[PDB]
Design a protein around this ligand. Structure first.
Ligand SMILES: *[C@@H]1O[C@H](CO)[C@@H](O[C@@H]2O[C@H](CO)[C@@H](O[C@@H]3O[C@H](CO[C@H]4O[C@@H](CO)[C@@H](O)[C@H](O)[C@@H]4O)[C@@H](O)[C@H](O[C@H]4O[C@H](CO)[C@@H](O)[C@H](O)[C@@H]4O)[C@@H]3O[C@@H]3OC[C@@H](O)[C@H](O)[C@H]3O)[C@H](O)[C@H]2NC(C)=O)[C@H](O[C@@H]2O[C@@H](C)[C@@H](O)[C@@H](O)[C@@H]2O)[C@H]1NC(C)=O
Ligand SMILES: *[C@@H]1O[C@H](CO)[C@@H](O[C@@H]2O[C@H](CO)[C@@H](O[C@@H]3O[C@H](CO[C@H]4O[C@@H](CO)[C@@H](O)[C@H](O)[C@@H]4O)[C@@H](O)[C@H](O[C@H]4O[C@H](CO)[C@@H](O)[C@H](O)[C@@H]4O)[C@@H]3O[C@@H]3OC[C@@H](O)[C@H](O)[C@H]3O)[C@H](O)[C@H]2NC(C)=O)[C@H](O[C@@H]2O[C@@H](C)[C@@H](O)[C@@H](O)[C@@H]2O)[C@H]1NC(C)=O
Ligand SMILES: *[C@@H]1O[C@H](CO)[C@@H](O[C@@H]2O[C@H](CO)[C@@H](O[C@@H]3O[C@H](CO)[C@@H](O)[C@H](O)[C@@H]3O[C@@H]3OC[C@@H](O)[C@H](O)[C@H]3O)[C@H](O)[C@H]2NC(C)=O)[C@H](O[C@@H]2O[C@@H](C)[C@@H](O)[C@@H](O)[C@@H]2O)[C@H]1NC(C)=O
Ligand SMILES: *[C@@H]1O[C@H](CO)[C@@H](O[C@@H]2O[C@H](CO)[C@@H](O[C@@H]3O[C@H](CO)[C@@H](O)[C@H](O)[C@@H]3O[C@@H]3OC[C@@H](O)[C@H](O)[C@H]3O)[C@H](O)[C@H]2NC(C)=O)[C@H](O[C@@H]2O[C@@H](C)[C@@H](O)[C@@H](O)[C@@H]2O)[C@H]1NC(C)=O
Ligand SMILES: *[C@@H]1O[C@H](CO)[C@@H](O[C@@H]2O[C@H](CO)[C@@H](O)[C@H](O)[C@H]2NC(C)=O)[C@H](O)[C@H]1NC(C)=O
Ligand SMILES: *[C@@H]1O[C@H](CO)[C@@H](O[C@@H]2O[C@H](CO)[C@@H](O)[C@H](O)[C@H]2NC(C)=O)[C@H](O)[C@H]1NC(C)=O
Ligand SMILES: *[C@@H]1O[C@H](CO)[C@@H](O)[C@H](O)[C@H]1NC(C)=O
Ligand SMILES: *[C@@H]1O[C@H](CO)[C@@H](O)[C@H](O)[C@H]1NC(C)=O
Ligand SMILES: *[C@@H]1O[C@H](CO)[C@@H](O)[C@H](O)[C@H]1NC(C)=O
Ligand SMILES: *[C@@H]1O[C@H](CO)[C@@H](O)[C@H](O)[C@H]1NC(C)=O
Ligand SMILES: *[C@@H]1O[C@H](CO)[C@@H](O)[C@H](O)[C@H]1NC(C)=O
Ligand SMILES: *[C@@H]1O[C@H](CO)[C@@H](O)[C@H](O)[C@H]1NC(C)=O
Ligand SMILES: *[C@@H]1O[C@H](CO)[C@@H](O)[C@H](O)[C@H]1NC(C)=O
Ligand SMILES: *[C@@H]1O[C@H](CO)[C@@H](O)[C@H](O)[C@H]1NC(C)=O
Ligand SMILES: *[C@@H]1O[C@H](CO)[C@@H](O)[C@H](O)[C@H]1NC(C)=O
Ligand SMILES: *[C@@H]1O[C@H](CO)[C@@H](O)[C@H](O)[C@H]1NC(C)=O
Ligand SMILES: *[C@@H]1O[C@H](CO)[C@@H](O)[C@H](O)[C@H]1NC(C)=O
Ligand SMILES: *[C@@H]1O[C@H](CO)[C@@H](O)[C@H](O)[C@H]1NC(C)=O
Ligand SMILES: O=C1O[C@H]([C@@H](O)CO)C(O)=C1O
Ligand SMILES: O=C1O[C@H]([C@@H](O)CO)C(O)=C1O
Ligand SMILES: [Zn+2]
Lengths: 499, 499
């Protein structure tokens, strides 16, 4: 029987009690990254994360930091492989920058052969060290040209441009890459890029944020979500019909959270919790498993929710070989009004729920996850059992999918000095406590999880936070980015993988 | 009789001998800037100078510097006006960033009202202090979307997009702006952007620079030059037909140089010198005054030189109310081969001339202009009399135009400390020695020059050089860009203007 801790102190950092041997022999362990966050702009065209961070610098991070140079994995990709090799990792998730291989967005305008070569060298280097690539085609970094021509995922023109981009990736790299991810965290761009305008491209209703250049927070998240699902599905169809000879697998990436009732004896909080599962996970998993949005979304969102044609429904339904599930934290849910007529209405209000980390009796859900210095009542707290709950829910609700955990990690403050940053025991605690629950759910519930990739390989530009927080298992000095030095967490992870 | 010095030491810094009263009472004196170089990216879309400096950082400057924040004239435009007001300047040349007012390039995609407001406030502030705006519509910063959709000025689609942009500027600002410049230094983008790939967008033939993403250095400079002339001319027609009620004037900006023979008794050097005038100035002034390219260009460039239709010729011919002439230096010319079949052929080789600052008997043309630390045989030297020669030539060759000197200045090294940088006596010398010759040419040759704008108001990002050189008459600390402090040159210029 497996027992896992939910509260500090944790004792799962002892590799005598928890290690890779605890899991099936074929289980993949590694780390993850994304292109905007690690490569730098050298050698590529411009994308909407360059555009957003430069047009709205105070949205890029408190330090106004951006991905212009970052950890320079364009130059130091070999050093990333060296970190992986030190870990004895068997998997690495990275993304391809669309703007590095088709800087002009539309494939017919030409490809960047040197960009293609960059990824060929990285892939070859990873395979030479026994590391399985998991490659994300779209980690938010849409070529700026496409956003300027037709507002990117707001328009159905995105579907064929994304399809032609993915075709080029399959053609050039699919002889070596056998695990493909289409779109990173489906929920994120619709809500943060087109709802709150916290993320690129930065569109929203005027009264939500007067800095937005255009938008409508009530309608555009649904349009963009719909186009993401159609673009994803068109790429999966292309993969499975035209690249079956490569013997690989493809899927979307979901951001997952668990939800608990803020008051577990209050039917209204219980109902808000179930609505959050549908509006946060079902928004995408309904279409991916059934070709339709959840009924509560149909009913609430009404004319603002697009319909799938029969052909579209068929395309989307079943459009995955596996799911990449990212998981960071869980929230309590309580009822909240949905003021659809308010000029500041957002799609996120349609779930009729307010989300917290503290429940009605004052209990904080778990240990600190992210401190908010401007506002400590906005601190985020984590919940190790949430990974168990999420995976169990996916197996039961969503037809026993094949899953890879494609991100899981925690930040530490950028104000810490190097010595403090390397002594990242809070990261060991976070990662081990989740891995314990992951092993427990696989054993107890027989969820088909076959790998785990921790966020992140190294310190990098964090969306929205610049360099004010660090997520790496390896440390990068921003005054001299060449080296990636394993922190205590990376050293622990090395021992967990090879105990 | 006016006597001007050509060699150090100069004595024209004494405002008892040379001042604004030396010139006609209506003569305009001020300084100049450009948008990419001073504003920062905040509040605007991305353009090809953002794209180039980020994709090819070692081309942006030795320091890899770029216009991301620069002197932050987006925030500190009032401080620029304050410098002008301190100088008692009567003119200021600045540019409008296309990407700030139509971030999506094509006007039908929407305008950025806050961008429009920025320029309205600057213009209102300048007029309130008695400063005449001279506004450049295009100072090289083409929206990146247009370069990605159709390669910008390489395609005739640029004509109508530039026309719709200029129409918006006339409509919004032309009630207050009465001097408009269309395209900055016509020669520069064709040659450096599409020939040598030293400037954005960075296209060239493969063997010229293997880093170029695409191009053909032999053909594309001529295509882009031709489209610049047509786009310019379409905007001048629009101005003069639709905005005559505003009572303003419009013209192109030329970069001018004078040319002297490397050996003034050698007919081959003399012929190269005359070919350089035609290929450097006549390439654009032929079409602007006659609707045709110079005959030597027709003969040499052959099928690589586009033709104007009769309608186009008529549109281009006479398409100016005045000329903005930038002038920095003069070169000696000697013959050089034109290897049109070489894979590394460039349009710049078609003139059949090699350019130097030292003549055949070893004479350096004048005082140091720009030191090249990697290569001192590549140092640039200036020649005060060249401004006299250029203006005389324009009056005689090009039909006695109305001229404003829209740039003239000199850099000092970014390695100098603040105290050295403020003690910029070499800049006083450069500016005064040119102003003496300018006054002399106006008096002796009756050239219709009506203003002079020194480059630059303040230190800024210098194209190709980052922050490794300074051009300002006012000093900016890159660790805290708010203040613009008048250097010795700015203090001198203040006394020259109000003696
Ligand atoms: C999995 O996908 C299946 C579909 O492949 C989902 O089942 C479909 O569920 C929908 C409701 O979402 C049912 O549609 C309703 O059909 C009524 C019956 O119509 C048929 O007979 C008529 C009925 O009197 C008639 O006019 C119609 O032309 C047919 O003959 C409808 O009136 C409903 O429309 C009203 O409600 C809509 C909102 O739900 C609203 O948008 C409409 O304006 C209308 O007011 C609805 O009809 C749908 O109307 C919209 C139009 O775009 C659609 O094409 C139209 O079908 C389907 O009948 C049902 N299909 C079948 C094959 O069962 C399934 O839904 C789950 O299961 C069903 C049983 C139900 O419990 C759902 O609530 C639950 O979500 C999806 N499963 C999951 C887990 O989501
Ligand atoms: C100012 O603009 C005026 C034009 O508005 C320039 O004058 C034009 O100059 C051109 C040369 O550049 C002369 O064109 C030549 O005309 C010959 C005579 O053709 C006429 O009679 C025929 C001749 O036997 C016949 O086929 C033709 O159809 C006419 O009836 C031509 O053969 C020349 O073409 C050869 O040379 C071309 C290169 O110059 C080459 O490109 C052609 O393939 C061809 O091999 C040329 O014809 C021109 O051919 C190209 C085609 O695209 C043009 O439409 C075609 O005209 C013009 O006759 C002359 N026009 C007039 C009204 O004078 C003027 O040029 C300057 O002055 C002229 C006198 C001359 O000295 C030029 O060398 C000098 O540049 C421009 N001024 C300035 C300062 O540039
Ligand atoms: C978890 O949710 C439960 C279920 O909602 C909360 O328990 C309920 O709390 C209500 C108070 O918020 C109770 O109602 C009150 O009852 C007293 C005694 O009769 C009465 O004087 C009140 O005015 C009020 O009555 C309601 O008034 C509004 C009407 O519309 C409604 O019909 C009335 O019921 C309610 O009885 C109670 N329900 C149950 C099943 O116990 C619970 O609140 C916590 O426990 C209750 C017992 C009470 O001690 C609250 O102070 C305490 O917050 C909530 N848990 C937490 C931690 O918030
Ligand atoms: C400025 O340009 C002028 C004109 O080109 C240069 O003067 C010319 O310089 C040529 C040497 O480069 C002279 O030709 C040489 O004459 C000597 C004496 O006869 C002879 O032995 C040579 O082999 C050579 O002759 C030429 O050989 C090549 C043949 O194709 C051609 O037909 C022959 O002429 C030439 O006479 C001379 N021309 C004139 C009008 O003086 C001038 O060069 C400078 O001055 C000359 C006098 C000489 O002292 C050169 O050493 C000195 O560089 C050049 N000025 C400069 C500073 O470079
Ligand atoms: C968001 O777009 C929606 C839909 O175009 C706008 O909502 C409509 O508001 C129009 C004008 O009031 C109403 O007539 C419709 O009944 C509403 N339609 C629906 C589907 O709700 C909404 O006003 C726009 N929001 C912003 C801030 O522009
Ligand atoms: C530049 O473009 C020119 C014109 O397309 C190319 O020049 C031609 O080369 C083609 C192939 O040799 C020849 O058949 C033509 O006779 C040449 N045409 C002319 C107008 O010169 C040139 O090769 C391209 N340069 C590069 C480096 O691509
Ligand atoms: C691995 O952990 C298991 C418990 O899951 C333990 O029994 C085994 O001894 C550990 N391996 C090592 C080498 O410590
Ligand atoms: C941040 O930037 C936007 C302009 O992009 C501005 O509207 C807002 O006032 C600034 N935020 C703060 C809190 O200063
Ligand atoms: C498959 O590739 C072929 C050849 O390029 C193409 O005709 C077909 O449309 C593609 N298919 C998809 C997405 O099925
Ligand atoms: C608008 O929304 C903010 C956040 O959604 C909220 O605090 C405020 O009450 C809202 N105002 C109106 C008029 O609804
Ligand atoms: C930067 O870091 C690398 C790796 O440690 C080191 O070899 C190099 O000398 C360092 N550069 C400077 C300027 O210190
Ligand atoms: C690498 O992991 C393999 C598989 O568990 C193990 O056999 C090998 O010893 C490990 N290598 C190192 C250096 O830890
Ligand atoms: C201005 O310079 C002129 C010579 O051009 C001189 O005669 C006049 O006195 C000077 N003005 C002052 C105030 O020094
Ligand atoms: C500068 O950058 C380009 C890539 O953009 C590269 O090809 C070239 O080698 C670099 N130049 C030098 C001298 O290092
Ligand atoms: C003038 O403006 C009118 C009205 O918009 C337009 O019809 C006409 O085409 C414009 N003209 C130019 C460039 O002459
Ligand atoms: C190519 O050009 C460089 C500069 O133009 C020159 O030094 C070299 O000789 C040229 N080579 C050939 C093959 O022409
Ligand atoms: C920056 O310069 C401005 C103007 O001199 C000054 O007022 C401000 O305090 C300075 N900021 C810092 C951080 O020194
Ligand atoms: C401004 O220049 C005008 C015109 O020459 C002059 O009358 C006025 O005194 C000058 N102001 C200052 C403060 O120098
Ligand atoms: O729950 C979530 O986790 C991440 C991130 O906030 C972790 O730092 C994200 O992008 C979600 O929406
Ligand atoms: O002659 C010229 O002067 C300038 C510049 O080099 C001055 O620094 C330029 O852009 C030309 O082509
Ligand atoms: Zn940047």
């Amino acid at each position: 029987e497996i027992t896992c801790q939910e509260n500090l102190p944790f004792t799962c950092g002892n590799t005598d009690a928890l290690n890779s041997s605890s899991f099936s022999s074929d289980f993949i362990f590694g780390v993850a990254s994304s292109a905007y966050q690690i490569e730098g702009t050298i050698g590529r065209g411009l994308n909407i994360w360059d555009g957003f961070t430069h047009r709205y610098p105070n949205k890029s991070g408190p330090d106004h930091g951006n991905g212009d140079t970052t950890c320079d994995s364009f130059s130091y990709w070999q050093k990333d492989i060296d970190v992986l090799d030190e870990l004895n990792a068997t998997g690495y998730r990275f993304s391809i920058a669309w703007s590095r291989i088709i800087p002009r967005g539309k494939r017919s305008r030409g490809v960047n052969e040197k960009g293609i070569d960059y990824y060929h060298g990285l892939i070859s280097g990873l395979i030479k060290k026994g590391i399985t690539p998991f490659v994300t085609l779209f980690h938010w970094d849409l070529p700026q040209t496409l956003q300027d021509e037709y507002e990117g995922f707001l328009d159905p023109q995105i579907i064929d441009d994304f399809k032609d981009y993915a075709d080029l990736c399959f053609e050039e790299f699919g002889d070596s890459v056998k695990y493909w991810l289409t779109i990173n965290q489906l929920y994120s761009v619709p809500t943060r890029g087109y709802g709150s305008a916290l993320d690129a491209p930065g569109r929203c209703s005027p009264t939500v944020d007067p800095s937005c250049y255009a938008g409508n927070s009530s309608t555009e998240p649904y349009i963009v979500a719909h186009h993401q699902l159609l673009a994803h599905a068109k790429v999966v169809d292309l993969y499975r019909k035209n690249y079956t000879h490569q013997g690989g697998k493809i899927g979307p990436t979901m951001i997952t959270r668990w939800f608990l009732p803020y008051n577990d004896t209050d039917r209204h909080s219980i109902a808000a919790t179930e609505r959050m599962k549908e509006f946060f996970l079902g928004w995408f998993m309904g279409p991916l498993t059934n070709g339709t949005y959840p009924q509560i979304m149909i009913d609430t969102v009404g004319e603002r929710l697009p319909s799938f044609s029969p052909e579209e429904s068929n395309l989307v339904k079943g459009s995955y070989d596996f799911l990449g599930l990212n998981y960071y934290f869980t929230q309590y849910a309580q009822p909240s009004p949905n003021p659809v007529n308010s000029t500041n209405h957002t799609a996120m209000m349609d779930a009729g729920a307010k989300l917290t980390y503290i429940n009605a009796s004052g209990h904080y859900i778990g240990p600190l996850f992210e401190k908010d210095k401007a506002d400590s009542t906005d601190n985020i707290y984590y919940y190790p059992k949430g990974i168990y709950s999420v995976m169990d829910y996916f197996k039961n609700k969503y037809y026993n999918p094949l899953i890879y955990v494609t991100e899981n990690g925690i930040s530490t403050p950028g104000d810490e000095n190097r010595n403090q940053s390397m002594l990242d025991y809070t990261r060991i605690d976070y990662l081990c406590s989740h891995l314990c629950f992951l092993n427990k759910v696989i054993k107890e519930k027989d969820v088909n999880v076959k790998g785990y990739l921790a966020w992140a390989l190294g310190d990098n530009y964090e969306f929205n936070k610049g360099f004010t927080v660090r997520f790496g298992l390896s440390y990068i000095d921003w005054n001299n980015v060449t080296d990636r030095d394993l922190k205590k967490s990376g050293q622990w992870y090395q021992s967990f993988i090879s105990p």
